[model samples]
Target chain A: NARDSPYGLSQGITKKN
Target chain B: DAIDDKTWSKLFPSIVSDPDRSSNFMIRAIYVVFSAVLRQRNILEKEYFSKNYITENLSCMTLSFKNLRAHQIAQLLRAAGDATKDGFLKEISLVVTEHDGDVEAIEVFSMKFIYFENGGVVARLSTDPHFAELAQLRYEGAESVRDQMVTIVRSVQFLCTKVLEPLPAEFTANFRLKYTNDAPSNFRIDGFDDSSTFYTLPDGIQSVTIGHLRPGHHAAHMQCWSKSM
Candidate 1:
C-alpha cells in the first residue's frame, strides 16, 4: 500500500502526505 | 499498561521541567553526533551510515581478509545471520569454534547487515579487543578512572561537531562497519594451534590437518601441515 501510494522508493513519485 | 507514564519526567527532571526543550529531539541529536565521531576516527566505515540508499544482493556477499584470530572471527560470526555457509563464511565459522566451543555453523549475512544497520557501533565494540578493553573500563565506572572516560567522550564530541552542521536536515541514519586492523597480513592469534594451522593453510584452495602427534612415551608435538601442498 505504501509502495502503491504516490510516495515510494521509485524516482519522480511525489505526495505531500 | 500503567495509568500514569511519568518515566520521562522522572528520568530527566531538568529537561522535562523546561517547556522549550524537546527530549526526543535532543536524544536523536546525541546519537547523530556520537556516530559522526566514530566515523571520523576511522573506527567505523561509512558505507553502512551514508544517506544514499541501495539494496544489497547478499547471495554473492563476500568477506576477505589476510589474517584473523579465532576470537576476532568470533566477533564477525556473532554478527552474521544463521543462514550463511560455504566460501568465506565457512572459513570464518571454523575460526569461531575457538571462541565458542563447537558452534554448529557460523553465518556472515546477519552480522554484515546489522553492522551497517546499527552504524557498526555494536560490532566494533564487541569484535575489537583493544576498543572493547577501553570501552569496558569506562563502563565499569570508577571515580579514579573518571578522567579517562571524560577525555574519550570529549575527543569524540570534538570530532563529531567538526563534521556535522548540528542541524536537523543534515541528520541521517543507518548501520556501520567496525574498524579492524585490516593492514595487509595483520593477525592476532589467541592459541598456538590456531596460529600453526593458519601457517599451514596455503595460498588458495589447499587442505591441511591440524593436531598433536604422539610419537613416543608421554611426548607429543603440535603439527599443522598441508594434506595437499
Candidate 2:
C-alpha cells in the first residue's frame, strides 16, 4: 500500500498525563 | 464558529449567505489555503533539495534532504533560496552600476540554494499556532481562498519581524517533541525556539563544585567554573 505520511518524526513525542 | 459578515463579504463579495454557511465557507477556506501553501513549498523541496542535493547531504542530521518532512525541509530551502535570490538581486544591481564591461552582457550567477542564509521564515511559520493546528488536522481528520489566505498572511506578518538564521542541528529532534515533555517546561530547548536554554551562573555562584552525587549507584562529579579568572 502506498501511504502518504506528511509528518514523519525522527523521534516522536508522547505525553504522560 | 461565529463568522464576521463584513470580513466574509469582503473576501467573497458575490456570496449571499447566512451566518452558518458563511462560517462553514471560511473553515473550508482555511484547509484549502493551508494545503495550497504546503503544496507549493513541497514543490520547491522536491525541485531544490530532493532532485539536486539528495545524495550530497544524505547523512546530514538536521538538513537531511530526503529524510525531512515538507514543512521542515521547506524551512531550509526557503531560507537558502530567498537568501540566494536576494544576494544575487543585490549583486546584479551593483554589477550594473560598477562594471565597465559590455552593457549588453548578461552574466549569469548561480549558487547552491542549500547554503543561503535567509532561511528561517519556514522555521517561524512552523511555530505558529494556526500552522500547528493545521498540521494537527492530519491526525484529527480535518477556504474562502481569501479568508483562508488570512492564515498565511498572519504567518507572514509574524515572519516579518523575525531575523533569518540557519536552523540548528537540534531542530528536528526538538520539533519531534515540541508539544511533549521530552522538552522541558522550564526552558526552551535548543532548535525548538529562538530563546537559548543554556545559561550562565551568577558571579557569586561561579566556581562551585559538587562531588559524590549518586546516579543510580554510579559516582558522578559535577563542577562549575566561570572562566577560571
Candidate 3:
C-alpha cells in the first residue's frame, strides 16, 4: 500500500499484488 | 479467470474482446475495473463512503448514465437502497404516470446529494425525456427495458430525498388520494384505488438504489426545484 498526505488534492496511489 | 485463460480456452474471448479489437476490450476492462474500484469508490483513502469523495461518485454516475437508459439508471439507484416512498418519492411516481404518454415514452430522472466545498449538502433532481424517435432503430423491440426504466426513474425522485437524509424508506406524498379508471357503467370502476401506497421499490443486488451521501440535514436554504435535463 502507498500512503500520501491528505492534502485533499492527492488521489490514486495504490496497487494490489 | 485471468487474461491468460483466453490463450488456452479461446471460447472465452467474448469475456474481454469484441469483434473489432482483442486488446482494446482488455485494456478498457483494466481501466474500468481500476477506475471503478479506485476512482469511483476511493477505497484507498476510505473516501468511498464520504460526501467529500464525490469525485468518484460523479465519475461512476457519468459512466453509468452513458451506458444505461434513463429508466435503467432509476432502477440502478433504487437497487442501491436509496429510494423512499410516501413523500417526494410518491409525488415523482405520480408525475411519471401522469406525464402525458403522448410525449416521450422513455425518460431518465436523477437526483444528486450535492456536496459543496463549504460543507453543505443540497439535494438536486434532474429529468431527461428519451424520445423513441430520437433513439436508434435497435431500441424499438426493447419496450420491457423502457417500461421497467420508467419505474426506476420514478423511484429516484424518492431516492434523492433519502440521499440527503435517512427519512422513512417508503412514503406516500398524498395524505388522501383517489384514482379513476374508466367504467362502462357509472358505478363500475375497472381499476383499484388507494388512499396511500408504497411508491419506492425495495433495494437489492439487481438494483443498487443506495445513497452514497451519509445521513445529514437537508439544506433547506439551498433547496432546489426539479428541473428537466
| Tens-place lDDT digits, model 1, residues B164-210 | 23322121222112212221122221211122121112245332211
Ten contiguous residues minimizing lDDT sum, candidate 1 chain B:
B213-222
| lDDT (10s digit) by residue, model 3, range B43-134 | 23323322221112121222233333323422322322121211111111111111222111111121221111111222223112112211
How much DockQ does model 2 earn?
0.03
**In model 2, what is the error at residue B217, expressed in angstroms?**
62
Q: What TM-score does model 3 achieve against the real structure?
A: 0.17
2 against 3, candidate with superior DockQ: 2
For all candidates, state DockQ relative to the true structure: 0.02, 0.03, 0.01
Q: How much lDDT does candidate 1 score?
A: 0.21
Off by over 4 Å in 1: A1-17, B1-141, B144-146, B161-173, B177-229
User: lDDT of model 2 at residue B45?
Assistant: 31
Candidate 3 — which residues are off by over 4 angstroms?
Answer: A1-17, B1-139, B143-162, B168-181, B184-229
CA lDDT, every model vs. true structure: 0.21, 0.23, 0.22
Give the winner by DockQ: 1 or 2.
Answer: 2
| TM-score values for chain B across all models | 0.19, 0.20, 0.18
